[PDB]
Amino acid sequence: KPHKFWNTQPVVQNDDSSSEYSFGPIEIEPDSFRKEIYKLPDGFSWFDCNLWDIESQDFEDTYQLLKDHYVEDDDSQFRFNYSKEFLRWALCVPGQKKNWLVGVRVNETKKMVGFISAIPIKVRIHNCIMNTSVVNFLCVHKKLRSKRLAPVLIKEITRRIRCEKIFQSIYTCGKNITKPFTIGTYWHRIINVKKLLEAGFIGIPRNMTMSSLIKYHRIPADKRIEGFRPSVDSDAEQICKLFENYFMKYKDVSNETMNNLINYDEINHSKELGKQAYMKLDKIEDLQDKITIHQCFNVEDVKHYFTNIDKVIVTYVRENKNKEITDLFSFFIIESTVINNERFPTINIAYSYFNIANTCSLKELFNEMLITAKNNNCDAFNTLDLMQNLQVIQDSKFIIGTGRLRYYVFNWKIPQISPSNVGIILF
Ligand SMILES: CCCCCCCCCCCCCC(=O)SCCNC(=O)CCNC(=O)[C@H](O)C(C)(C)COP(=O)(O)OP(=O)(O)OC[C@H]1O[C@@H](n2cnc3c(N)ncnc32)[C@H](O)[C@@H]1OP(=O)(O)O
Ligand SMILES: Cc1nc(NC(=O)c2cccc3c2C(=O)N(c2ccc4ccccc4c2N2CCCNCC2)C3)sc1C
Ligand SMILES: [Cl-]
Ligand SMILES: [Cl-]
Ligand SMILES: [Cl-]
Ligand SMILES: [Cl-]
The missing domain is CATH 3.40.630.30 (Gcn5-related N-acetyltransferase (GNAT))
Incomplete structure (x- = not known):
């Protein structure tokens, strides 16, 4: 229709x-x-x-x-x-x-x-x-x-x-509403088996029990990575540079274009001037493994988003000896009500936010983040296949979710791209 x-x-x-x-x-x-x-x-x-x-x-x-x-x-x-x-x-x-x-x-x-x-x-x-x-x-x-x-x-x-x-x-x-420029798939890492099992989220495969299931979804702790700690306000300027370096590394434009980006705010006041934002791409293949659309953060934004608030947002950074920040992981927390059981205990789910792994692999970073999610009483950790998150999802204990996430942009043209080309996380 x-x-x-x-x-x-x-x-x-x-x-x-x-x-x-x-x-x-x-x-x-x-x-x-x-x-x-x-x-x-x-x-x-x-x-x-x-x-x-x-x-x-x-x-x-x-x-x-x-x-x-x-x-x-x-x-x-x-x-x-x-x-x-x-x-x-x-x-x-x-x-x-x-x-x-x-x-x-x-x-x-x-x-x-x-x-x-x-x-x-x-x-x-x-x-x-x-x-x-x-x-x-x-x-x-x-x-x-x-x-x-x-x-x-x-x-x-x-x-x-x-x-x-x-x-x-x-x-x-x-x-699906109109045409989305990408479709993200989300995945679940089970942390609290008992809670999710009684909530109806997961079942029991044949020949297994809650015990063997708890043992299987266990979070490993045999190769910990030292130097991770919660972020604080004084980390803001260095977290800002960490993101800039990250987006510079994964950019889908030349170094010359990245230094002379078209500021649409200065040309949207005119129909003729705004057309300078038109850009044709000859080869869609030029975007492979690169970020095409992502949020930008100044120091004031970093202070707000990449902080630590109990039961809301968790941000950790890794330091070197000189107190310079080299890695970051973050996730936010939302409660989910069980619709057919008003008396079920509280279900807290963690959601992968922005993550930058420079001194370890992304899988290594997410394991540390899963340990921290366990410490924050999160029953599951949800991730989208955005940015490089596929490296963590493949050959893992993540389980595919039931739906898919469509991404739209209002009053802008974006060709259909992979979720790995997207660095936008909605709440
Ligand atoms: C430059 C600035 C621009 C700013 C605006 C940018 C765009 C932002 C747009 C909003 C993005 C919000 C982002 C989020 O928060 S996404 C989640 C939205 N909220 C929920 O899903 C909660 C549960 N459901 C509801 O609250 C209602 O069902 C809603 C309010 C969703 C629709 O109410 P209802 O179910 O009573 O329907 P209707 O008879 O009033 O109206 C029918 C029309 O509504 C179109 N529809 C249905 N669902 C959505 C949807 N999720 N995004 C966009 N459009 C939607 C549908 O195509 C149809 O249009 P058409 O098919 O006839 O054309
Ligand atoms: C473990 C467990 N996970 C459940 N998910 C649901 O019910 C559910 C239902 C409908 C749609 C969605 C979900 C759900 O998780 N999405 C999801 C999955 C992964 C994300 C990763 C990063 C950022 C957001 C993510 C996100 N969001 C949810 C917050 C709102 N912004 C939109 C996208 C969309 S229930 C349950 C017991
Ligand atoms: Cl679709
Ligand atoms: Cl209408
Ligand atoms: Cl440490
Ligand atoms: Cl602080």
């Missing part, structure tokens, strides 16, 4: 017949976009969600909405239970705008029935760099589904983002 909203938006459609590998914006309309607030059905209202005071009623309403109505696995066995501390870390980022956190409320009862958010980030896409957005936590109350409310919330957040002179966005989905 055909789209009724997405067929009208500047994104590559599923039937695109482009005969060329091209990068660049799809449309350049700095002045023609709608600026008036969108209208909601009678008895509903917009509000800027107050996630700036963790004790606010807005925060309680948002937490409850997402706990009961946000993302479930494709088999409706588990639902995400984002904590307030996680949402604050994930949405109150540097440069965030108070009106990029959009809620929908029933006027008569003050019940919050909808939500959508965006955060600002910096990205490199091939030979361009820009300030862009990431849309996440789109949620509509279950009883209001299939009433064309989601396009309204999308149009609304788009208006608010464009009013900040930002005209692209990145967003992920478990299903």
Whole structure:
């Protein structure tokens, strides 16, 4: 069946017949976009969600909405239970705008029935760099589904983002909407066998028991790598350089292009000037084993994202004798509710974030990270096949998950690429 909203938006459609590998914006309309607030059905209202005071009623309403109505696995066995501390870390980022956190409320009862958010980030896409957005936590109350409310919330957040002179966005989905520029596969490393076995996540193969299963999913500790410790704020500048060196090494453009990236923020104000971001690629094979699109981090961003908050985010670095940082691993933590058992204990899952292995192999780095995940009472460690993570997944004890993660970019052209070419991690 055909789209009724997405067929009208500047994104590559599923039937695109482009005969060329091209990068660049799809449309350049700095002045023609709608600026008036969108209208909601009678008895509903917009509000800027107050996630700036963790004790606010807005925060309680948002937490409850997402706990009961946000993302479930494709088999409706588990639902995400984002904590307030996680949402604050994930949405109150540097440069965030108070009106990029959009809620929908029933006027008569003050019940919050909808939500959508965006955060600002910096990205490199091939030979361009820009300030862009990431849309996440789109949620509509279950009883209001299939009433064309989601396009309204999308149009609304788009208006608010464009009013900040930002005209692209990145967003992920478990299903196919339009054409995604890549599809990521996630994998599970079992840590707490007993918990996951009783939660219904894993079974028992023939001729095995929980004991032999615990023994098999054991995390090895016979070749530890010394020098890893939690990051602190004073590591920020060196973690910033560690990422820059990492993205410089895996770049998919020449050294000359990397030093003269096209700053789209300076040419998106004009239709003629913005076309300088058009870039044709003659050989898609030139991107093999390289990163084509990735987030960029300054020191203020590093301080926020690559910190340590109990039950939210974990970041470790490896040092040498001189206190210089040479490796980094990180994962964030989200609780998952068991849908058919409201009394089941807490299930905490770890999610691979950004990881840089220079003084050890990536498999060696992930083992240290798995040990640290065990120390943080995480029942499983989830990883996507992004960047170089395939090195850890192949010939391992990782188990394939049931779904796949589609990656989209709003108002930008990206040819279909491998997930290994992508350095973008959504929350
Ligand atoms: C420059 C700035 C631009 C900023 C904007 C950038 C783009 C951001 C876009 C948002 C990305 C968010 C990123 C995340 O957080 S991804 C996860 C989103 N949240 C959930 O999955 C939680 C559980 N489910 C729900 O909350 C609702 O089912 C939602 C709200 C998802 C849809 O509500 P409902 O189920 O009641 O449907 P409808 O009748 O209102 O409307 C039908 C239309 O909605 C399109 N649809 C359905 N699901 C998604 C989806 N996950 N991404 C994009 N579009 C989606 C669908 O194609 C159809 O369009 P078309 O097929 O007719 O065309
Ligand atoms: C061990 C265990 N894993 C479960 N996963 C689910 O239920 C589930 C259901 C639907 C969709 C998803 C999941 C799930 O894990 N995804 C997943 C998997 C690996 C990631 C690696 C890095 C970053 C994110 C990752 C990520 N996200 C989830 C957070 C939100 N950002 C989108 C992508 C998507 S339940 C359970 C008991
Ligand atoms: Cl619609
Ligand atoms: Cl797809
Ligand atoms: Cl040590
Ligand atoms: Cl600190």
